[PDB]
C-alpha cells in the first residue's frame, strides 16, 4: 500500500521458572498492522531461534511523523539477499516524512534491481541534522542558495479530442 511505520514488541512465551522474558522492539515499515506482525517474526528468526507458536506480540503501535511540515534529508541503509551474494547500499533521499522516504526508496529499488518487498531489508533510516554531511551529489544539488529553475518543458494534459488553437507549450 501507501506505507505506515509500526512499533512491534514481542517477548517469547512465559514458561515454568522463566518469569518475564526480555521483550524485543522493532520499527517495521508496512502497509497495515497484519503485515507488520508477519514482518516482525521474519526478522526475529534470523537474529535468534524463535517462532510464531513459541512466542507472542505484546504491543503493536503506529508511529506518526513528528514534523511532517518540515522538509528533511534522510539517509537510508539497505541490504537485500540477491543475486548471488548479498551487499549493502546507502542512498540519500530528500523527503518530508520517514514513511514517504521509504515509499520512494522501494519504488527506486524495484526499478534498478528487479527485486521485491520480501527481498529487501531496511537496516536503519536516519534524519541528517546538519548539511554538508550530505555525501551524495544529487541531494546536495537542491541545498544551494536562492534556488530557481523552470518547469521542465511543460507538457500539456489533453482534455479534448479536437482543439482549434494550435497549442502553445507555455512558457
Amino acid at each position: 500500500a501507501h506505507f505506515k511505520e509500526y512499533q512491534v514488541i514481542g517477548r517469547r512465551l512465559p514458561t515454568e521458572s522463566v518469569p518475564e522474558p526480555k521483550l524485543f522492539r522493532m520499527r517495521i515499515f508496512a502497509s497495515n498492522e497484519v503485515i507488520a506482525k508477519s514482518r516482525y517474526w521474519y526478522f526475529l528468526q534470523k537474529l535468534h531461534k524463535v517462532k510464531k507458536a513459541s512466542g507472542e506480540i505484546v504491543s503493536i503501535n503506529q508511529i506518526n511523523e513528528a514534523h511532517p511540515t518540515k522538509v528533511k534529508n534522510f539517509g537510508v541503509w539497505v541490504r537485500y539477499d540477491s543475486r548471488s551474494g548479498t551487499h549493502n547500499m546507502y542512498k540519500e533521499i530528500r523527503d518530508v516524512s520517514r514513511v514517504a522516504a521509504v515509499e520512494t526508496l522501494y519504488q527506486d529499488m524495484a526499478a534498478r534491481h528487479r527485486a521485491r518487498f520480501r527481498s529487501i531489508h531496511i537496516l536503519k533510516v536516519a534524519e541528517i541534522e546538519k548539511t554538508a554531511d550530505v555525501k551524495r551529489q544529487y541531494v546536495k544539488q537542491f541545498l544551494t542558495k536562492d534556488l530557481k529553475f523552470p518547469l521542465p518543458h511543460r507538457v500539456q494534459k489533453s482534455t479534448k479530442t479536437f482543439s482549434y488553437k494550435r497549442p502553445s507549450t507555455f512558457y
Binding site: G75, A126, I128, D133, K135
Partner: peptide
C-alpha cells in the same frame, strides 16, 4: 559514505559491555 558512522561502533561497544558482564555476574 555515511554521516553518523562513529556513533554505531560506540553503540555496539556499549551494547556488548552488558553481554560481557551480565552472563558472568
Amino acid at each position: 559514505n555515511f554521516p553518523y558512522k562513529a556513533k554505531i561502533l560506540e553503540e555496539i561497544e556499549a551494547k556488548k559491555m552488558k553481554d560481557l558482564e551480565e552472563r558472568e555476574l
